[PDB]
Design a protein around this ligand. Structure first.
Ligand SMILES: Nc1ncnc2c1ncn2[C@@H]1O[C@H](COP(=O)(O)OP(=O)(O)CP(=O)(O)O)[C@@H](O)[C@H]1O
Ligand SMILES: [Mg+2]
Length: 278
């Protein structure tokens, strides 16, 4: 973790509450120095919460700080600095919501050229993450965690990776169960203490590729009980059906990225190269 700048209450102008996070509130603001629109994420552990949930909220907030302090890439949501009383993160405001809510608008499909811009922007973000020393394992890559800067095909940045808790950056492999099984690698969801790497994010990216391509949620075509669903993904190689009209080069990238064997999941230099050829 590198140096993180501190900003006093004098250096920001609160505008409105824009959302509600896992550990507190989210506000829209302005940086008084250069008039930059910002998102302020506060850490509020109310005395209504229990012991185990309160410590999970603090460690969640701090991991996001520790990981984001080293990050500097146009396709990753940027940390401007920290605030105290209450502990707050000052983030760059990303004006066009998230990928999840945009894809729900079935009446207005994202055109093919912008879809490609989104795919590449996210891949570049994750490529940068996996090129870190040690590599960053997001552990929560899904359409709600992809923020949209612009839907214009000619924009400098269209998509940005966001929400870096539950994220890890270690010289040794990580472990732990992950909840959202429709987005997460088989080696992460099998109700055990299994070891995995950044290749779990490569699996998640394949689901992101599917959701952009189709506009649909991964695994929504199937309906199983939780235990059965996990077993099908793990042991039976259950995957979302790629439509017949998908470009052969994209289909290969998706298929390879959601391989049951994590070693067969490609390096992102290959992923970026292949996507750019679309
Ligand atoms: N950098 C940013 N730019 C623009 N809006 C942002 C933003 N950061 C947060 N928001 C807004 O605040 C809302 C609060 O959600 P947040 O960003 O805290 O994710 P979350 O912690 O709720 C994901 P989950 O709890 O499901 O793991 C978001 O839905 C978004 O609308
Ligand atoms: Mg998260």
């Amino acid at each position: 973790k590198s140096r993180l700048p501190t900003l006093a209450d004098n250096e920001i102008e609160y505008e409105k509450q824009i959302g509600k996070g896992g550990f507190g509130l989210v506000h829209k603001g302005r940086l008084v120095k250069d008039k930059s629109v910002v998102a302020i994420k506060s850490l509020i552990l109310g005395d209504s919460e229990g012991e185990t949930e309160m410590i999970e909220k603090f460690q969640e907030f701090q991991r996001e700080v520790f990981i984001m302090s080293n990050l500097n890439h146009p396709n990753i949501v940027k940390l401007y600095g920290l605030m105290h009383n209450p502990p707050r993160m000052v983030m760059e405001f990303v004006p066009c919501g998230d990928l999840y809510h945009r894809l729900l608008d079935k009446a207005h499909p994202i055109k093919w050229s912008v879809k490609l811009r989104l795919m590449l922007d996210i891949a570049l973000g994750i490529e940068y993450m996996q090129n870190q020393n040690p590599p960053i394992v997001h552990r929560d890559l899904r359409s709600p965690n992809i923020f949209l800067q612009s839907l214009d095909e000619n924009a400098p940045v269209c998509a940005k990776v966001a929400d870096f808790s539950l994220s890890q950056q270690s010289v040794h492999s990580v472990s732990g169960l992950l909840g959202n099984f429709q987005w997460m690698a088989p080696e992460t969801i099998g109700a055990e203490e299994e070891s995995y790497t950044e290749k779990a994010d490569t699996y998640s990216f394949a689901m992101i590729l599917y959701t952009i391509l189709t506009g649909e949620g991964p695994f929504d075509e199937y309906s199983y009980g939780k235990i059965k669903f996990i077993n099908m993904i793990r042991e039976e190689g259950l995957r979302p059906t790629i439509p017949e009209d998908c470009p052969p080069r994209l289909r290969n990238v998706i298929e390879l990225c959601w391989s049951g064997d994590p070693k067969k999941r490609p390096h992102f230099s290959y992923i970026v190269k292949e996507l750019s050829e679309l």
